[PDB]
Design an enzyme around this catalytic site. Structure first.
Site, PDB file in Angstrom:
ATOM      1  CG  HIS A 108       0.386  10.180   7.115  1.00 56.85           C
ATOM      2  ND1 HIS A 108      -0.661   9.445   6.543  1.00 56.85           N
ATOM      3  CD2 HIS A 108       0.070  11.489   6.947  1.00 56.85           C
ATOM      4  CE1 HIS A 108      -1.527  10.299   6.035  1.00 56.85           C
ATOM      5  NE2 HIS A 108      -1.140  11.525   6.299  1.00 56.85           N
TER       6      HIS A 108
ATOM      7  CG  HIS B 188       2.959   5.712   5.909  1.00 58.09           C
ATOM      8  ND1 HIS B 188       2.687   5.611   7.256  1.00 58.09           N
ATOM      9  CD2 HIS B 188       1.878   6.278   5.332  1.00 58.09           C
ATOM     10  CE1 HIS B 188       1.484   6.133   7.478  1.00 58.09           C
ATOM     11  NE2 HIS B 188       0.952   6.493   6.313  1.00 58.09           N
TER      12      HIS B 188
ATOM     13  CG  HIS C 246      -0.862   8.415   2.057  1.00 58.26           C
ATOM     14  ND1 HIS C 246      -1.538   7.214   2.055  1.00 58.26           N
ATOM     15  CD2 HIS C 246      -0.515   8.648   3.341  1.00 58.26           C
ATOM     16  CE1 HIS C 246      -1.633   6.767   3.304  1.00 58.26           C
ATOM     17  NE2 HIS C 246      -0.983   7.603   4.093  1.00 58.26           N
TER      18      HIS C 246
ATOM     19  CG  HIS D 232      -1.585  -1.423   1.368  1.00 57.87           C
ATOM     20  ND1 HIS D 232      -2.594  -1.864   0.535  1.00 57.87           N
ATOM     21  CD2 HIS D 232      -1.340  -2.440   2.218  1.00 57.87           C
ATOM     22  CE1 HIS D 232      -2.965  -3.081   0.893  1.00 57.87           C
ATOM     23  NE2 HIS D 232      -2.214  -3.454   1.907  1.00 57.87           N
TER      24      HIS D 232
ATOM     25  CB  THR E 229      -5.904   7.612   5.986  1.00 60.13           C
ATOM     26  OG1 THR E 229      -4.587   7.202   5.673  1.00 60.13           O
ATOM     27  CG2 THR E 229      -5.936   8.916   6.770  1.00 60.13           C
TER      28      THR E 229
ATOM     29  CD  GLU F 113      -4.111   9.267   3.056  1.00 61.39           C
ATOM     30  OE1 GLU F 113      -3.817   9.219   4.272  1.00 61.39           O
ATOM     31  OE2 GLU F 113      -4.606   8.296   2.434  1.00 61.39           O
TER      32      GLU F 113
HETATM   33  N1  LIG Z   1      -2.286   6.413   7.015  1.00 62.74           N
HETATM   34  S1  LIG Z   1      -2.175   6.546   8.617  1.00 62.74           S
HETATM   35  O1  LIG Z   1      -3.480   6.999   9.167  1.00 62.74           O
HETATM   36  O2  LIG Z   1      -1.005   7.335   9.076  1.00 62.74           O
HETATM   37  C1  LIG Z   1      -1.859   4.878   9.223  1.00 62.74           C
HETATM   38  C2  LIG Z   1      -1.698   4.927  10.738  1.00 62.74           C
HETATM   39  C3  LIG Z   1      -1.522   3.582  11.416  1.00 62.74           C
HETATM   40  C4  LIG Z   1      -0.322   2.805  10.908  1.00 62.74           C
HETATM   41  C5  LIG Z   1       0.225   1.693  11.828  1.00 62.74           C
HETATM   42  C6  LIG Z   1      -0.641   0.458  12.013  1.00 62.74           C
HETATM   43  B1  LIG Z   1      -2.245   0.371  11.448  1.00 62.74           B
HETATM   44  B2  LIG Z   1      -3.061  -0.593  12.693  1.00 62.74           B
HETATM   45  B3  LIG Z   1      -1.849  -1.062  13.925  1.00 62.74           B
HETATM   46  C7  LIG Z   1      -0.352  -0.457  13.402  1.00 62.74           C
HETATM   47  B4  LIG Z   1      -0.607  -2.109  13.159  1.00 62.74           B
HETATM   48  B5  LIG Z   1      -2.331  -2.224  12.666  1.00 62.74           B
HETATM   49  B6  LIG Z   1      -2.533  -1.342  11.132  1.00 62.74           B
HETATM   50  B7  LIG Z   1      -1.017  -2.225  11.420  1.00 62.74           B
HETATM   51  B8  LIG Z   1      -0.947  -0.609  10.720  1.00 62.74           B
HETATM   52  B9  LIG Z   1       0.245  -1.101  11.962  1.00 62.74           B
HETATM   53 ZN   LIG Z   2      -0.793   7.516   6.122  1.00 62.08          ZN
END
Ligand SMILES: [N]S(=O)(=O)[C][C][C][C][C]C123[B@]45[B@]67[B@@]89[C@@]1%10B81%11B698B746B814B562B%10%1143
Ligand SMILES: [Zn+2]
Length: 257
Positions: free
Chosen positions: A116, A91, A93, A61, A195, A103
């Site tokens: 982010h 990371h 986008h 992703h 997101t 975003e």
């Molecule tokens: N695009 S964002 O909103 O910055 C994503 C924020 C969360 C990323 C980290 C995570 B999400 B939930 B818990 C932690 B484990 B499970 B899923 B896996 B990814 B890593």
């Molecule tokens: Zn993000």
């Protein structure tokens, strides 16, 4: 299964993740004229001097740089937050062209990309537990515009050829995330969500007003990544952004006048 295509993209996500249509989803459009200056908001405290990067990963992703979050080495505190939040990963986008990719939007303006920096509240001990809490995560969001290069980004883009496809990773030590930050820590803040699936409503969003500039060559390297695993049809990892979601009963606060 979920992704960013016509048949598995953001408009589909609610079928596996019904919170997609909940009351505090992210991202949102930041209407700069409607945001309320809150003189009680504190300056954000970003303490990244002892950050320890570990790995860089294509997760199918986006790509992410992961940090050692087993101690308080790289933490966010202050601003709208109560307590200390440890940096887990960052990371991005981005778009297929420079006019989209972010975003969040600012008065409907889309940026070429959005960084982010994901942090979790140490009171909950681990990120898995924090994602189940309404104040579990703090994500610091930074807009990227295209222009001058960001020298501090270059170490990241130079290794992307080694993680082209989903599932690839590499050692990625001694990367300093301070070199991705703009001058000002002026911010907007609101309560929201992840997101990406599972779209959990656990995030205090902190979105910097000042974008960073990156070069066309830097963002073009992002766009050479693949959503697919090696051996599957090549599908460029572009347009991996969720569009703005309804604000509903939320106020965006500004740290600045
Ligand atoms: N695009 S964002 O909103 O910055 C994503 C924020 C969360 C990323 C980290 C995570 B999400 B939930 B818990 C932690 B484990 B499970 B899923 B896996 B990814 B890593
Ligand atoms: Zn993000």
């Amino acid at each position: 299964h979920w992704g960013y295509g016509k048949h598995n993209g953001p408009e589909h996500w609610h079928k596996d993740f019904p919170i997609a249509k909940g009351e505090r989803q992210s991202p949102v459009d930041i209407d700069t004229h409607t945001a309320k200056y809150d003189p009680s908001l504190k300056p954000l405290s970003v303490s990244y001097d002892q950050a320890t990067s570990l790995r860089i990963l294509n997760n199918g992703h986006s790509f992410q740089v992961t940090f050692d979050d087993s101690q308080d080495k790289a933490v966010l505190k202050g601003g709208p937050l109560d307590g200390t939040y440890r940096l887990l990963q960052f990371h991005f986008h981005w778009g297929s062209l420079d006019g989209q990719g972010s975003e969040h939007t600012v008065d409907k303006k889309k940026y070429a990309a959005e960084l982010h920096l994901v942090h979790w509240n140490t009171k909950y001990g681990d990120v898995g537990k924090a994602v189940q809490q309404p104040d579990g995560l703090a994500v610091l969001g930074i807009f990227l515009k295209v222009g001058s290069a960001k020298p501090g980004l270059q170490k990241v883009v130079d290794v992307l050829d080694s993680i082209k496809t989903e599932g690839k990773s590499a050692d990625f030590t001694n990367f300093d995330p301070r070199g991705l930050l703009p001058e000002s820590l002026d911010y907007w803040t609101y309560p929201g969500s992840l997101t990406t699936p599972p779209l959990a409503e656990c995030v205090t969003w902190i979105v910097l007003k000042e974008p960073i500039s990156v070069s066309s060559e830097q963002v073009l390297k992002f766009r050479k990544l693949n959503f697919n695993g090696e051996g599957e049809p090549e599908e460029l990892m572009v347009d991996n952004w969720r569009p703005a979601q309804p604000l509903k009963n939320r106020q965006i606060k500004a740290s600045f006048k």
